[PDB]
Design a protein around this ligand. Structure first.
Ligand code: HEM
Ligand SMILES: *[C@@H]1O[C@H](CO)[C@@H](O[C@@H]2O[C@H](CO)[C@@H](O[C@H]3O[C@H](CO)[C@@H](O)[C@H](O)[C@@H]3O)[C@H](O)[C@H]2NC(C)=O)[C@H](O)[C@H]1NC(C)=O
Ligand SMILES: *[C@@H]1O[C@H](CO)[C@@H](O[C@@H]2O[C@H](CO)[C@@H](O[C@H]3O[C@H](CO)[C@@H](O)[C@H](O)[C@@H]3O)[C@H](O)[C@H]2NC(C)=O)[C@H](O)[C@H]1NC(C)=O
Ligand SMILES: *[C@@H]1O[C@H](CO)[C@@H](O[C@@H]2O[C@H](CO)[C@@H](O)[C@H](O)[C@H]2NC(C)=O)[C@H](O)[C@H]1NC(C)=O
Ligand SMILES: *[C@@H]1O[C@H](CO)[C@@H](O[C@@H]2O[C@H](CO)[C@@H](O)[C@H](O)[C@H]2NC(C)=O)[C@H](O)[C@H]1NC(C)=O
Ligand SMILES: CC(=O)Oc1ccccc1C(=O)O
Ligand SMILES: [Ca+2]
Length: 595
């Protein structure tokens, strides 16, 4: 007895059916089931949700009710006893650049977003939750354990709001609570253009027929464009330096200004759209604005898919790559392309790959300025350092020359994110991303670690000795048992991230399985996948294979020296070469005659 009635919170419309362009909402990708993969719908469930009361309450909500007979430990204690570390030396990945971490965040934001609950404009819940830590409704505070230094200095808890769910959002109940994915599931560049009709339109430059995206009008970066500023005050980007008063950037995705390197990436993409756009007009002068926009847009979608599948996943999945994502075989209308709820947690392996600093390099790739190396936390929601401190070129050089942080069992997440994370909404640099993650696993009703091992067909340890062998680490296995009492209670996020990495990969077996299946699906169930016969012509695909992130760089900055393989670790100047030597995307194949 199914239930697929429930729905409304969804912006729907009719389909075009022989239209060559994806919709903004993702609707109509699948002809037989039109809303599959669309934005503003529930995340798919690969396993049933697991709640304290079986429907909506998170585990750890009712301090008396246990999970399999035990109390589940506070997310912050786990963060404190297993995730933190003090010494940053020796923690960098010797063969993965800072761009490796950054692309991951970009693919992520393209695929999923479960925003927090509102009903809170002009709200005191907004305060009944930060001031007094009273648990209730959508307020599910992260309590501080005894002996936490934040006690003495911050309060009794860290505010936290539950994720949105469907059918409504206010006081609801009935079936099992399913969170929302506010963006399209397909890998389609929805982060550049938006996932809603409204925002997509406001992002475009409609005062002219060139099919370009709107650009900042207050500042330019050496003639090159900037994303436009965001309308909405109170702005967090201006709260961090009330003298600079530079607002956040307005983009296709709302998290765009979370950190300066993510904003840099968004800018690089915006720029490529316009470039691609003025170039296409030049070869087909009669094309109107719509055609220029959709056509460029489609090129860029094919770009992100290529870099992701050809250059990125192979070094995340490693030797497991082929075990989950076999050679492409054509569109499969039976493959469900929805992003699963657990994937949004599996993809968070990236948080343990973020180093404590971001650097800026001048043109010889040497420290730019005196205070060239900044601590990560000073850059959450920091747009002023771009606009008033050198543009994006210095940051892009850092992306190519610095390394990512390597995941390590005794040194998982940097304190820059574990104690000094900045929320939009709040006023301090004192949040814990690691604790938020664990708290979100429960909010989302995730099955424990062992449920997912079974799912992936991997052993399921029940004993300390069992866990030691799987984690191949006596001590961590130990900390994990003292806190969880049973491996069946270990939250998927930490359980999955504590495993050793597979050969040539950056994630372990459980994650490789969870990541691998998800990507296989968004590829096989995407009617618009770039390799799908009829989407692009044979000659257009031969052109699209020469796309390189190195090139994306050369064409949209004033950097003339770039690595050939921008994801592996490269040393300047030996591994860098003149832009003049890098393959360019050939567009003549897009030229469409007449008569
Ligand atoms: C600061 C933050 C980052 C870097 C300086 C950062 C980075 C990443 C990378 C590199 C990811 C994948 C390779 C990745 C995935 C996901 N993130 Fe994270 N991220 C920073 C900050 C946050 C915050 C805060 C959240 C929200 C947590 C919450 O539950 O409230 C966050 C989320 C996610 C996320 C879930 C997305 C969703 O579907 O709602 C990832 C898959 N990041 N980040
Ligand atoms: C740093 O990471 C690099 C990537 O993980 C790695 O180099 C890669 O090694 C693989 C080994 O299989 C090779 O991969 C390519 O080999 C042929 C081309 O000769 C292709 O047809 C294959 O499909 C495959 O893509 C490459 O030599 C290289 N891959 C790339 C994309 O550059 C380095 O070995 C790592 N450094 C160290 C010290 O381990
Ligand atoms: C808030 O943003 C301010 C910039 O908008 C920033 O101050 C700026 O940064 C430095 C001061 O530390 C100045 O630049 C340096 O270079 C000039 C070159 O002309 C030299 O004369 C000085 O050595 C100078 O330090 C900027 O001019 C300065 N701008 C202003 C208006 O002060 C603040 O530091 C930011 N505040 C925080 C807390 O981040
Ligand atoms: C929309 O596009 C138009 C045309 O490309 C932009 O107008 C040009 O802006 C630059 C700098 O202002 C200059 O070349 C001219 O002032 C404009 N040229 C023309 C032909 O109008 C305009 O800036 C864009 N609008 C937005 C909001 O980005
Ligand atoms: C298209 O995708 C479907 C769904 O993933 C594949 O279906 C599996 O195929 C086997 C053999 O027919 C079935 O017995 C299983 O029930 C299916 N497994 C699952 C988990 O659904 C199918 O193989 C794909 N077909 C092509 C031609 O690519
Ligand atoms: C999802 C992500 O990367 O988002 C954020 C994290 C901390 C604070 C703000 C945001 C945001 O999107 O506004
Ligand atoms: Ca998308």
């Amino acid at each position: 007895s199914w239930e697929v009635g429930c729905g409304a919170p969804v912006p729907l419309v009719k389909c075009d059916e022989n239209s060559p362009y994806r919709t903004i909402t993702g609707d109509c990708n699948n002809r037989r089931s039109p809303a599959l993969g669309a934005a503003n719908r529930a995340l798919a469930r690969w396993l049933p949700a697991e709640y304290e009361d079986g429907l909506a309450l998170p585990f750890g909500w009712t301090q008396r009710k246990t999970r399999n007979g035990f109390r589940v430990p506070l997310a912050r204690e786990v963060s404190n006893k297993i995730v933190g570390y003090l010494d940053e030396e020796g923690v960098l990945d010797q063969n993965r650049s800072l761009l490796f971490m950054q692309w991951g965040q970009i693919v992520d934001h393209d695929l999923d977003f479960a925003p927090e609950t509102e009903l809170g404009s002009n709200e005191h819940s907004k305060t009944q939750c930060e001031e007094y830590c009273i648990q209730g409704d959508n307020c599910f505070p992260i309590m501080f354990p005894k002996n936490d230094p934040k006690l003495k200095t911050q309060g009794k808890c860290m505010p936290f709001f539950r994720a949105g769910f469907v059918c409504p959002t206010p006081p609801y109940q009935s079936l099992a609570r399913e969170q929302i994915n506010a963006v399209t599931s397909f890998l389609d560049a929805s982060l550049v253009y938006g996932s809603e009709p409204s925002l997509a339109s406001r992002l475009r430059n409609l005062s002219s027929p060139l099919g370009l995206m709107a650009v900042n009008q207050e500042a330019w970066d050496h003639g090159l464009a900037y994303l436009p500023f965001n309308n909405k005050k109170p702005s967090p980007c201006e709260f961090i330096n009330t003298t600079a008063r530079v607002p956040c950037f307005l983009a296709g995705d709302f998290r765009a200004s979370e950190q300066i390197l993510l904003a840099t990436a968004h800018t690089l993409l915006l720029r490529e759209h316009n470039r691609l756009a003025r170039e296409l007009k030049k070869l087909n002068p009669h094309w109107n604005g719509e055609k220029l926009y959709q056509e460029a847009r489609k090129i860029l979608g094919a770009f992100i898919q290529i870099i992701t599948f050809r250059d990125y996943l192979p070094i995340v999945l490693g030797s497991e790559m082929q075990k989950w994502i076999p050679p492409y075989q054509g569109y499969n209308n039976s493959v469900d392309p929805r992003i699963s709820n657990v994937f949004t947690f599996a993809f968070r392996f990236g948080h343990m790959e973020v180093p404590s600093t971001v650097s800026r390099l001048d043109e010889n790739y040497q420290p730019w300025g005196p205070e060239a190396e900044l601590p990560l936390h000073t850059l959450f929601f920091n747009t002023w350092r771009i606009i008033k401190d050198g543009g994006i070129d210095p940051l892009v050089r850092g992306l190519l020359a610095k390394k990512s942080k390597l995941m390590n069992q005794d040194k998982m997440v940097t304190s820059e994110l574990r104690n000094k994370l900045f929320q939009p909404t709040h006023k301090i640099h004192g949040f814990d991303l690691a604790a938020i993650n664990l708290q979100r696993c429960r909010d989302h009703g995730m099955p424990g670690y062992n449920s997912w091992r079974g799912f992936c067909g991997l052993s399921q340890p029940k004993t300390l000795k069992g866990l030691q062998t799987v984690l191949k680490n006596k001590i961590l296995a130990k900390k994990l048992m003292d806190l969880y009492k049973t491996p069946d209670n270990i939250d998927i996020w930490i359980g999955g991230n504590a495993e050793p990495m597979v050969e040539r990969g950056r994630v372990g077996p459980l994650l490789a399985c969870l990541l691998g299946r998800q990507f296989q699906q968004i590829r096989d169930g995407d009617r618009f996948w770039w390799e799908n016969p009829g989407v692009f012509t044979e000659k257009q695909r031969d052109s699209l294979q020469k796309v390189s992130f190195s090139r994306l760089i050369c064409d949209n900055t004033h950097i003339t020296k770039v690595p050939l393989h921008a994801f592996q670790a490269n040393n300047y100047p030996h591994d860098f070469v003149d832009c003049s030597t890098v393959d360019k995307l050939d567009l003549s194949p897009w030229a469409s005659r007449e008569n």
